[model samples]
Target: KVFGRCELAAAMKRHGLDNYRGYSLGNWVCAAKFESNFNTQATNRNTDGSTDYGILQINSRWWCNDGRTPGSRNLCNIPCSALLSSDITASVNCAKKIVSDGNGMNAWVAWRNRCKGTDVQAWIRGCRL
Candidate 1:
Protein backbone atom coordinates (compact mmCIF):
# COMPACT_ATOMS: atom_id res chain seq x y z
CA LYS A 1 0.00 0.00 0.00
CA VAL A 2 2.93 2.31 -0.59
CA PHE A 3 2.62 5.52 -2.57
CA GLY A 4 4.68 8.32 -4.10
CA ARG A 5 7.40 7.82 -6.70
CA CYS A 6 9.94 5.52 -5.07
CA GLU A 7 7.17 3.67 -3.29
CA LEU A 8 5.14 3.00 -6.39
CA ALA A 9 7.13 -0.05 -7.34
CA ALA A 10 6.83 -1.46 -3.87
CA ALA A 11 3.12 -0.80 -3.84
CA MET A 12 2.80 -2.51 -7.18
CA LYS A 13 4.78 -5.45 -5.92
CA ARG A 14 2.69 -5.77 -2.77
CA HIS A 15 -0.43 -5.79 -4.90
CA GLY A 16 0.92 -8.21 -7.48
CA LEU A 17 0.95 -5.59 -10.19
CA ASP A 18 4.57 -6.04 -11.18
CA ASN A 19 5.04 -6.65 -14.88
CA TYR A 20 1.67 -8.14 -15.96
CA ARG A 21 -0.70 -10.36 -14.05
CA GLY A 22 -3.77 -10.49 -16.34
CA TYR A 23 -5.28 -7.67 -14.38
CA SER A 24 -5.48 -4.09 -15.63
CA LEU A 25 -2.13 -2.62 -14.64
CA GLY A 26 -1.30 -1.58 -18.14
CA ASN A 27 -4.79 -0.30 -18.73
CA TRP A 28 -4.88 1.52 -15.44
CA VAL A 29 -1.41 2.87 -15.97
CA CYS A 30 -2.38 4.03 -19.41
CA ALA A 31 -5.51 5.65 -18.07
CA ALA A 32 -3.67 7.41 -15.30
CA LYS A 33 -0.89 8.36 -17.65
CA PHE A 34 -3.40 10.01 -19.92
CA GLU A 35 -5.49 11.55 -17.18
CA SER A 36 -2.66 12.80 -15.00
CA ASN A 37 0.63 11.68 -16.44
CA PHE A 38 1.07 9.56 -13.30
CA ASN A 39 0.94 12.71 -11.19
CA THR A 40 -0.72 12.00 -7.87
CA GLN A 41 -1.63 15.65 -7.32
CA ALA A 42 -3.36 16.29 -10.60
CA THR A 43 -6.69 18.10 -10.79
CA ASN A 44 -8.75 19.17 -13.74
CA ARG A 45 -12.01 20.95 -14.51
CA ASN A 46 -14.68 18.64 -15.77
CA THR A 47 -17.25 19.57 -18.40
CA ASP A 48 -20.07 19.38 -15.88
CA GLY A 49 -18.49 22.12 -13.80
CA SER A 50 -17.20 19.61 -11.26
CA THR A 51 -13.58 18.71 -10.74
CA ASP A 52 -11.46 15.61 -11.34
CA TYR A 53 -8.58 15.35 -8.95
CA GLY A 54 -5.61 13.21 -7.94
CA ILE A 55 -3.82 10.44 -9.80
CA LEU A 56 -6.91 8.53 -10.83
CA GLN A 57 -8.66 11.67 -11.96
CA ILE A 58 -11.59 11.00 -9.65
CA ASN A 59 -14.60 13.23 -10.00
CA SER A 60 -15.07 14.92 -6.69
CA ARG A 61 -18.81 15.33 -7.05
CA TRP A 62 -19.59 11.67 -7.60
CA TRP A 63 -17.16 10.51 -4.95
CA CYS A 64 -18.30 13.03 -2.40
CA ASN A 65 -21.92 12.07 -2.90
CA ASP A 66 -21.11 8.41 -2.58
CA GLY A 67 -20.65 8.52 1.19
CA ARG A 68 -16.98 9.32 1.02
CA THR A 69 -15.70 11.98 3.39
CA PRO A 70 -15.11 15.30 1.72
CA GLY A 71 -11.50 15.39 2.78
CA SER A 72 -10.94 11.96 1.31
CA ARG A 73 -13.39 12.29 -1.56
CA ASN A 74 -10.74 12.54 -4.23
CA LEU A 75 -9.43 9.09 -3.47
CA CYS A 76 -12.65 7.46 -2.36
CA ASN A 77 -15.22 5.42 -4.22
CA ILE A 78 -12.96 5.21 -7.22
CA PRO A 79 -11.03 2.15 -8.33
CA CYS A 80 -8.30 4.21 -9.93
CA SER A 81 -7.57 6.15 -6.78
CA ALA A 82 -7.44 2.99 -4.74
CA LEU A 83 -5.05 1.58 -7.30
CA LEU A 84 -2.67 4.48 -6.87
CA SER A 85 -3.09 4.79 -3.12
CA SER A 86 -3.86 1.75 -1.03
CA ASP A 87 -4.47 -1.44 -2.98
CA ILE A 88 -3.54 -1.84 -6.59
CA THR A 89 -4.72 -5.44 -6.56
CA ALA A 90 -8.10 -4.57 -5.12
CA SER A 91 -8.46 -1.66 -7.47
CA VAL A 92 -7.76 -3.82 -10.47
CA ASN A 93 -10.03 -6.50 -9.11
CA CYS A 94 -12.83 -3.97 -8.95
CA ALA A 95 -11.96 -2.74 -12.40
CA LYS A 96 -12.24 -6.29 -13.70
CA LYS A 97 -15.78 -6.42 -12.43
CA ILE A 98 -16.58 -3.13 -14.06
CA VAL A 99 -15.04 -4.29 -17.29
CA SER A 100 -16.72 -7.64 -17.12
CA ASP A 101 -20.15 -6.20 -16.46
CA GLY A 102 -20.19 -4.21 -19.65
CA ASN A 103 -17.97 -3.07 -22.47
CA GLY A 104 -15.01 -4.88 -21.04
CA MET A 105 -11.69 -3.13 -21.62
CA ASN A 106 -12.80 -1.62 -24.87
CA ALA A 107 -14.44 1.39 -23.30
CA TRP A 108 -11.48 2.12 -21.08
CA VAL A 109 -9.05 1.54 -23.88
CA ALA A 110 -10.97 3.94 -26.09
CA TRP A 111 -11.15 6.52 -23.36
CA ARG A 112 -7.50 6.17 -22.54
CA ASN A 113 -6.45 6.43 -26.14
CA ARG A 114 -8.63 9.45 -26.70
CA CYS A 115 -7.31 11.15 -23.62
CA LYS A 116 -3.70 10.35 -24.50
CA GLY A 117 -4.10 11.38 -28.12
CA THR A 118 -2.96 8.02 -29.40
CA ASP A 119 -4.38 4.83 -30.78
CA VAL A 120 -6.03 3.11 -27.84
CA GLN A 121 -5.76 -0.45 -29.10
CA ALA A 122 -2.24 0.10 -30.29
CA TRP A 123 -1.16 1.57 -26.99
CA ILE A 124 -2.79 -1.26 -25.05
CA ARG A 125 -1.19 -3.83 -27.30
CA GLY A 126 2.18 -2.19 -26.93
CA CYS A 127 1.81 -2.35 -23.17
CA ARG A 128 2.18 -6.14 -23.50
CA LEU A 129 -0.62 -6.90 -21.13
Candidate 2:
Protein backbone atom coordinates (compact mmCIF):
# COMPACT_ATOMS: atom_id res chain seq x y z
CA LYS A 1 0.00 0.00 0.00
CA VAL A 2 1.37 3.32 -1.04
CA PHE A 3 -0.57 5.80 1.02
CA GLY A 4 -1.37 9.27 -0.13
CA ARG A 5 -0.12 12.12 2.04
CA CYS A 6 -3.40 12.77 3.82
CA GLU A 7 -4.21 9.08 3.96
CA LEU A 8 -0.97 8.35 5.77
CA ALA A 9 -1.65 11.22 8.15
CA ALA A 10 -5.08 9.85 8.95
CA ALA A 11 -3.71 6.35 9.43
CA MET A 12 -0.99 7.50 11.79
CA LYS A 13 -3.49 9.50 13.78
CA ARG A 14 -5.70 6.45 14.00
CA HIS A 15 -2.74 4.57 15.49
CA GLY A 16 -2.15 7.36 18.05
CA LEU A 17 0.85 8.99 16.33
CA ASP A 18 -0.63 12.50 16.42
CA ASN A 19 1.38 14.29 19.12
CA TYR A 20 2.45 10.94 20.48
CA ARG A 21 5.65 12.53 21.74
CA GLY A 22 5.01 16.20 21.21
CA TYR A 23 5.29 15.68 17.45
CA SER A 24 2.41 16.68 15.19
CA LEU A 25 0.55 14.63 12.63
CA GLY A 26 2.18 16.58 9.84
CA ASN A 27 5.61 15.92 11.22
CA TRP A 28 5.00 12.18 11.04
CA VAL A 29 3.50 12.41 7.60
CA CYS A 30 6.44 14.44 6.38
CA ALA A 31 8.95 12.03 7.81
CA ALA A 32 7.18 9.10 6.22
CA LYS A 33 7.18 10.92 2.91
CA PHE A 34 10.91 11.20 2.97
CA GLU A 35 11.58 7.89 4.62
CA SER A 36 9.59 5.53 2.46
CA ASN A 37 7.37 7.72 0.37
CA PHE A 38 4.39 6.15 2.14
CA ASN A 39 5.12 2.75 0.66
CA THR A 40 4.34 -0.10 2.98
CA GLN A 41 6.76 -2.44 1.20
CA ALA A 42 9.70 -0.09 1.22
CA THR A 43 13.03 -1.64 2.17
CA ASN A 44 16.60 -0.42 2.33
CA ARG A 45 19.72 -2.28 3.27
CA ASN A 46 22.35 -0.23 5.06
CA THR A 47 26.10 -0.24 4.63
CA ASP A 48 26.45 -1.68 8.10
CA GLY A 49 24.41 -4.77 7.17
CA SER A 50 21.22 -3.58 8.86
CA THR A 51 18.03 -3.01 6.96
CA ASP A 52 15.28 -0.41 7.17
CA TYR A 53 11.76 -1.65 6.59
CA GLY A 54 8.18 -0.42 6.09
CA ILE A 55 6.59 2.98 5.71
CA LEU A 56 8.43 4.47 8.66
CA GLN A 57 11.56 2.57 7.65
CA ILE A 58 12.15 1.08 11.06
CA ASN A 59 15.61 -0.47 11.35
CA SER A 60 16.59 -4.04 11.97
CA ARG A 61 19.61 -3.18 14.10
CA TRP A 62 17.55 -2.16 17.11
CA TRP A 63 13.84 -2.19 16.36
CA CYS A 64 13.47 -5.55 14.70
CA ASN A 65 15.30 -8.83 14.27
CA ASP A 66 15.85 -10.01 10.76
CA GLY A 67 18.21 -12.71 11.99
CA ARG A 68 20.78 -11.09 9.75
CA THR A 69 21.67 -7.86 11.47
CA PRO A 70 24.65 -8.25 13.77
CA GLY A 71 23.72 -8.11 17.46
CA SER A 72 20.16 -7.01 16.75
CA ARG A 73 18.27 -5.99 19.86
CA ASN A 74 14.80 -6.55 18.49
CA LEU A 75 13.48 -4.07 21.01
CA CYS A 76 10.14 -3.99 19.30
CA ASN A 77 9.95 -7.77 19.60
CA ILE A 78 8.89 -8.17 16.01
CA PRO A 79 10.29 -9.77 12.89
CA CYS A 80 11.60 -7.31 10.35
CA SER A 81 9.40 -8.95 7.74
CA ALA A 82 6.38 -7.95 9.79
CA LEU A 83 7.00 -4.31 9.03
CA LEU A 84 6.74 -4.89 5.28
CA SER A 85 3.07 -5.77 5.29
CA SER A 86 0.34 -3.36 4.23
CA ASP A 87 -1.35 -3.83 7.61
CA ILE A 88 0.90 -1.10 9.12
CA THR A 89 0.06 -1.96 12.72
CA ALA A 90 3.56 -3.33 13.35
CA SER A 91 5.12 -0.39 11.59
CA VAL A 92 3.17 2.15 13.62
CA ASN A 93 3.84 0.40 16.92
CA CYS A 94 7.54 0.04 16.22
CA ALA A 95 7.72 3.65 15.18
CA LYS A 96 6.28 4.67 18.54
CA LYS A 97 8.84 2.47 20.25
CA ILE A 98 11.62 4.15 18.31
CA VAL A 99 10.56 7.65 19.31
CA SER A 100 9.89 6.57 22.89
CA ASP A 101 13.58 5.80 23.31
CA GLY A 102 14.15 9.44 24.24
CA ASN A 103 15.06 10.12 20.61
CA GLY A 104 11.74 11.98 20.29
CA MET A 105 11.33 11.21 16.58
CA ASN A 106 14.95 12.02 15.92
CA ALA A 107 15.50 8.31 15.71
CA TRP A 108 14.76 8.62 12.04
CA VAL A 109 17.21 10.66 10.00
CA ALA A 110 14.41 11.39 7.56
CA TRP A 111 12.41 13.02 10.34
CA ARG A 112 15.37 15.03 11.55
CA ASN A 113 16.41 16.23 8.13
CA ARG A 114 12.99 16.73 6.54
CA CYS A 115 10.47 17.32 9.28
CA LYS A 116 12.29 18.75 12.28
CA GLY A 117 12.35 22.51 12.75
CA THR A 118 9.99 23.02 9.84
CA ASP A 119 6.41 23.94 8.98
CA VAL A 120 5.09 20.43 8.66
CA GLN A 121 1.54 21.67 9.07
CA ALA A 122 1.39 22.08 5.31
CA TRP A 123 1.78 18.33 5.06
CA ILE A 124 -1.61 17.97 6.60
CA ARG A 125 -3.22 21.21 5.59
CA GLY A 126 -6.20 19.69 3.81
CA CYS A 127 -6.42 16.51 5.84
CA ARG A 128 -9.05 18.05 8.14
CA LEU A 129 -7.66 16.21 11.15
Candidate 3:
Protein backbone atom coordinates (compact mmCIF):
# COMPACT_ATOMS: atom_id res chain seq x y z
CA LYS A 1 0.00 0.00 0.00
CA VAL A 2 3.08 2.21 0.01
CA PHE A 3 3.33 4.93 -2.70
CA GLY A 4 6.44 6.36 -4.31
CA ARG A 5 7.05 9.59 -6.21
CA CYS A 6 6.44 8.29 -9.72
CA GLU A 7 3.26 6.58 -8.71
CA LEU A 8 2.12 9.75 -7.04
CA ALA A 9 2.90 11.72 -10.15
CA ALA A 10 0.84 9.41 -12.29
CA ALA A 11 -1.98 9.70 -9.82
CA MET A 12 -1.87 13.45 -9.96
CA LYS A 13 -1.90 13.41 -13.72
CA ARG A 14 -5.06 11.40 -13.85
CA HIS A 15 -6.86 14.22 -12.11
CA GLY A 16 -5.41 16.97 -14.36
CA LEU A 17 -2.70 17.93 -11.88
CA ASP A 18 0.76 17.81 -13.41
CA ASN A 19 2.83 20.12 -11.22
CA TYR A 20 2.82 18.18 -7.99
CA ARG A 21 6.29 16.71 -8.04
CA GLY A 22 7.27 18.71 -5.00
CA TYR A 23 3.95 18.11 -3.31
CA SER A 24 3.56 15.88 -0.29
CA LEU A 25 1.66 12.64 -0.39
CA GLY A 26 1.51 12.77 3.36
CA ASN A 27 -0.53 15.94 3.13
CA TRP A 28 -2.88 14.46 0.56
CA VAL A 29 -3.28 11.34 2.61
CA CYS A 30 -4.02 13.39 5.68
CA ALA A 31 -6.69 15.40 3.88
CA ALA A 32 -8.22 12.23 2.51
CA LYS A 33 -8.39 10.74 5.97
CA PHE A 34 -9.89 13.85 7.47
CA GLU A 35 -12.34 14.39 4.64
CA SER A 36 -13.34 10.86 3.86
CA ASN A 37 -11.60 8.65 6.40
CA PHE A 38 -9.54 7.19 3.56
CA ASN A 39 -12.54 5.27 2.42
CA THR A 40 -12.24 4.94 -1.32
CA GLN A 41 -15.75 3.62 -1.54
CA ALA A 42 -17.32 6.15 0.73
CA THR A 43 -20.52 7.81 -0.47
CA ASN A 44 -22.83 10.43 0.94
CA ARG A 45 -26.39 11.44 0.14
CA ASN A 46 -26.51 15.14 -0.52
CA THR A 47 -29.19 17.46 0.82
CA ASP A 48 -30.40 17.89 -2.74
CA GLY A 49 -30.75 14.10 -2.89
CA SER A 50 -27.70 13.63 -5.05
CA THR A 51 -24.81 11.32 -4.14
CA ASP A 52 -21.16 12.12 -3.57
CA TYR A 53 -18.59 9.38 -3.69
CA GLY A 54 -14.93 8.33 -3.39
CA ILE A 55 -11.89 9.18 -1.23
CA LEU A 56 -12.34 12.91 -1.73
CA GLN A 57 -16.05 12.39 -1.80
CA ILE A 58 -16.34 14.10 -5.16
CA ASN A 59 -19.85 14.95 -6.19
CA SER A 60 -19.42 13.26 -9.51
CA ARG A 61 -23.01 13.93 -10.26
CA TRP A 62 -22.41 17.65 -10.17
CA TRP A 63 -18.98 17.86 -11.80
CA CYS A 64 -19.04 15.16 -14.41
CA ASN A 65 -22.45 15.69 -16.02
CA ASP A 66 -23.09 11.97 -15.63
CA GLY A 67 -24.69 12.16 -12.22
CA ARG A 68 -24.01 8.59 -11.14
CA THR A 69 -25.77 7.05 -14.06
CA PRO A 70 -24.86 3.41 -14.42
CA GLY A 71 -22.20 2.61 -17.00
CA SER A 72 -21.40 6.26 -17.47
CA ARG A 73 -17.90 6.87 -18.81
CA ASN A 74 -17.52 9.97 -16.70
CA LEU A 75 -15.00 9.63 -13.90
CA CYS A 76 -17.61 10.78 -11.45
CA ASN A 77 -19.80 7.85 -12.31
CA ILE A 78 -17.01 5.52 -11.40
CA PRO A 79 -17.03 4.31 -7.84
CA CYS A 80 -14.47 5.53 -5.33
CA SER A 81 -12.87 2.11 -5.26
CA ALA A 82 -12.03 2.42 -8.92
CA LEU A 83 -11.06 6.06 -8.54
CA LEU A 84 -8.48 5.06 -5.93
CA SER A 85 -7.42 1.86 -7.56
CA SER A 86 -3.85 2.06 -8.91
CA ASP A 87 -3.76 5.84 -8.50
CA ILE A 88 -4.50 7.09 -5.02
CA THR A 89 -2.17 9.98 -5.65
CA ALA A 90 -4.20 11.10 -8.65
CA SER A 91 -7.48 10.76 -6.84
CA VAL A 92 -6.19 12.66 -3.84
CA ASN A 93 -4.56 15.26 -6.01
CA CYS A 94 -7.82 15.77 -7.84
CA ALA A 95 -9.63 16.23 -4.58
CA LYS A 96 -7.00 18.65 -3.40
CA LYS A 97 -7.30 20.68 -6.57
CA ILE A 98 -11.04 20.81 -6.21
CA VAL A 99 -10.62 22.16 -2.73
CA SER A 100 -7.76 24.53 -3.44
CA ASP A 101 -7.85 25.24 -7.19
CA GLY A 102 -4.42 23.73 -7.99
CA ASN A 103 -2.81 24.78 -4.70
CA GLY A 104 -3.19 21.29 -3.32
CA MET A 105 -0.44 21.67 -0.77
CA ASN A 106 -1.79 25.00 0.40
CA ALA A 107 -5.16 23.38 0.86
CA TRP A 108 -3.44 20.86 3.08
CA VAL A 109 -2.01 23.69 5.14
CA ALA A 110 -5.46 25.21 5.47
CA TRP A 111 -6.75 21.86 6.61
CA ARG A 112 -4.03 21.70 9.21
CA ASN A 113 -4.92 25.16 10.50
CA ARG A 114 -8.63 24.50 10.55
CA CYS A 115 -8.67 20.91 11.61
CA LYS A 116 -6.13 21.51 14.34
CA GLY A 117 -5.02 19.05 17.03
CA THR A 118 -5.21 16.15 14.61
CA ASP A 119 -2.13 13.95 14.15
CA VAL A 120 -2.55 14.12 10.36
CA GLN A 121 -1.04 17.59 10.07
CA ALA A 122 2.02 16.63 12.08
CA TRP A 123 2.58 13.51 10.04
CA ILE A 124 2.22 15.38 6.73
CA ARG A 125 4.46 18.24 7.81
CA GLY A 126 7.17 15.78 8.86
CA CYS A 127 7.18 13.91 5.57
CA ARG A 128 10.45 14.20 3.64
CA LEU A 129 12.14 12.65 0.62
Candidate 4:
Protein backbone atom coordinates (compact mmCIF):
# COMPACT_ATOMS: atom_id res chain seq x y z
CA LYS A 1 0.00 0.00 0.00
CA VAL A 2 1.19 3.48 -0.78
CA PHE A 3 0.36 5.69 2.18
CA GLY A 4 -0.40 9.36 1.97
CA ARG A 5 1.99 11.66 3.82
CA CYS A 6 -0.20 12.27 6.83
CA GLU A 7 -1.30 8.67 6.97
CA LEU A 8 2.27 7.55 7.10
CA ALA A 9 3.05 10.13 9.76
CA ALA A 10 0.27 8.86 11.95
CA ALA A 11 1.38 5.31 11.42
CA MET A 12 4.93 6.10 12.45
CA LYS A 13 3.71 7.89 15.53
CA ARG A 14 1.34 5.07 16.37
CA HIS A 15 4.32 2.72 16.30
CA GLY A 16 6.17 4.88 18.82
CA LEU A 17 8.56 6.64 16.46
CA ASP A 18 7.69 10.09 17.83
CA ASN A 19 10.88 11.52 19.30
CA TYR A 20 12.26 8.04 19.31
CA ARG A 21 15.88 8.28 20.38
CA GLY A 22 15.66 12.03 19.86
CA TYR A 23 14.60 11.77 16.25
CA SER A 24 11.28 13.49 15.86
CA LEU A 25 8.29 11.87 14.20
CA GLY A 26 8.70 14.31 11.31
CA ASN A 27 12.25 13.09 10.78
CA TRP A 28 11.00 9.56 10.37
CA VAL A 29 8.21 10.70 8.09
CA CYS A 30 10.68 12.50 5.89
CA ALA A 31 12.99 9.52 5.73
CA ALA A 32 10.12 7.32 4.68
CA LYS A 33 9.24 9.72 1.89
CA PHE A 34 12.71 9.51 0.43
CA GLU A 35 13.39 5.90 1.28
CA SER A 36 10.34 4.23 -0.17
CA ASN A 37 7.79 6.94 -0.70
CA PHE A 38 5.68 5.29 1.97
CA ASN A 39 5.10 2.29 -0.25
CA THR A 40 5.05 -0.94 1.63
CA GLN A 41 5.79 -2.96 -1.52
CA ALA A 42 8.77 -0.96 -2.59
CA THR A 43 12.09 -2.77 -2.96
CA ASN A 44 15.35 -1.55 -4.33
CA ARG A 45 18.49 -3.52 -5.11
CA ASN A 46 21.79 -2.20 -3.87
CA THR A 47 25.16 -2.24 -5.61
CA ASP A 48 26.35 -4.62 -2.93
CA GLY A 49 23.71 -7.05 -4.20
CA SER A 50 21.68 -6.55 -1.05
CA THR A 51 18.23 -5.05 -1.13
CA ASP A 52 16.19 -2.48 0.76
CA TYR A 53 12.65 -3.50 1.61
CA GLY A 54 9.39 -1.81 2.48
CA ILE A 55 8.37 1.59 3.85
CA LEU A 56 11.49 2.31 5.88
CA GLN A 57 13.52 0.32 3.37
CA ILE A 58 15.17 -1.97 5.89
CA ASN A 59 18.37 -3.44 4.52
CA SER A 60 18.82 -7.12 3.88
CA ARG A 61 22.50 -7.02 4.79
CA TRP A 62 21.85 -5.98 8.36
CA TRP A 63 18.22 -6.44 9.21
CA CYS A 64 16.05 -8.96 7.45
CA ASN A 65 16.85 -12.43 6.15
CA ASP A 66 16.28 -12.41 2.42
CA GLY A 67 18.36 -15.58 2.05
CA ARG A 68 20.23 -13.83 -0.75
CA THR A 69 22.39 -11.12 0.80
CA PRO A 70 25.68 -12.81 1.59
CA GLY A 71 26.49 -12.97 5.30
CA SER A 72 23.34 -11.10 6.25
CA ARG A 73 23.26 -10.69 10.01
CA ASN A 74 19.46 -10.72 9.97
CA LEU A 75 19.64 -8.86 13.24
CA CYS A 76 15.91 -8.35 13.04
CA ASN A 77 15.64 -12.12 12.59
CA ILE A 78 12.61 -11.64 10.41
CA PRO A 79 11.86 -12.65 6.84
CA CYS A 80 12.36 -9.71 4.52
CA SER A 81 8.91 -10.35 3.14
CA ALA A 82 7.40 -9.31 6.43
CA LEU A 83 8.51 -5.76 5.82
CA LEU A 84 6.56 -5.63 2.57
CA SER A 85 3.20 -5.89 4.20
CA SER A 86 0.94 -2.88 4.42
CA ASP A 87 0.30 -3.58 8.07
CA ILE A 88 3.63 -1.84 8.80
CA THR A 89 3.95 -3.29 12.28
CA ALA A 90 6.88 -5.47 11.32
CA SER A 91 8.58 -2.72 9.38
CA VAL A 92 8.28 -0.30 12.30
CA ASN A 93 9.60 -2.93 14.69
CA CYS A 94 12.65 -3.54 12.55
CA ALA A 95 13.26 0.18 12.08
CA LYS A 96 13.22 0.65 15.83
CA LYS A 97 15.66 -2.20 16.23
CA ILE A 98 17.99 -0.63 13.68
CA VAL A 99 18.03 2.68 15.53
CA SER A 100 18.28 1.09 18.96
CA ASP A 101 21.18 -0.99 17.67
CA GLY A 102 23.24 2.20 17.81
CA ASN A 103 23.13 2.97 14.11
CA GLY A 104 20.42 5.51 14.84
CA MET A 105 18.38 6.89 11.93
CA ASN A 106 21.66 7.35 10.11
CA ALA A 107 21.37 3.72 9.21
CA TRP A 108 19.25 4.90 6.31
CA VAL A 109 21.16 7.00 3.82
CA ALA A 110 17.94 8.75 2.80
CA TRP A 111 17.70 10.12 6.31
CA ARG A 112 21.28 11.35 6.30
CA ASN A 113 21.15 12.87 2.85
CA ARG A 114 17.65 14.28 2.77
CA CYS A 115 15.95 14.34 6.12
CA LYS A 116 18.73 14.82 8.65
CA GLY A 117 19.13 18.24 10.27
CA THR A 118 16.25 19.56 8.18
CA ASP A 119 12.84 20.91 9.03
CA VAL A 120 10.67 17.89 8.35
CA GLN A 121 7.55 19.17 10.00
CA ALA A 122 6.19 20.09 6.61
CA TRP A 123 6.18 16.47 5.70
CA ILE A 124 3.30 16.12 8.08
CA ARG A 125 1.64 19.44 7.54
CA GLY A 126 -2.15 19.53 7.16
CA CYS A 127 -2.34 16.12 8.77
CA ARG A 128 -4.16 15.66 12.03
CA LEU A 129 -1.28 13.51 13.20
| lDDT on C-alpha atoms for all candidate structures | 0.47, 0.89, 0.49, 0.89
Candidate 3 runs further than 4 Å off: 1-26, 65-86, 96-121, 125-129
TM value for model 4: 0.95
TM-score computed on alpha carbons, candidate 1: 0.46
Give the alpha carbon lDDT tens digit for every residue of 1-129 in model 4.
Answer: 999998888888988999989888889889889999888999999999999999999889988999898887888889999999989999988888889987788888989999887888878789996
lDDT of prediction 4: 0.89
Better of 2 and 4 by lDDT: 4
Better of 1 and 3 by lDDT: 3
Off by over 4 Å in 1: 1-10, 16-22, 65-111, 114-129
lDDT of 3 by residue, 89-115 (tens): 445545644555544444344355644
Taking the tens digit of each residue's C-alpha lDDT, what string does model 1 give over 52-125?
A: 55555555554422233344433234533443444345444444444455454453443545544444333344
In model 3, state the lDDT of residue 71. Answer: 35
Q: TM-score rank, highest first? A: 2, 4, 3, 1
Candidate 2 Cα outliers beyond 4 Å, as residue runs: none
lDDT of 2 by residue, 22-50 (tens): 88898889988999999999999999999
TM-score of each: 0.46, 0.96, 0.48, 0.95
For model 3, the local distance difference test gives 0.49
True lDDT of residue 121, candidate 2: 93
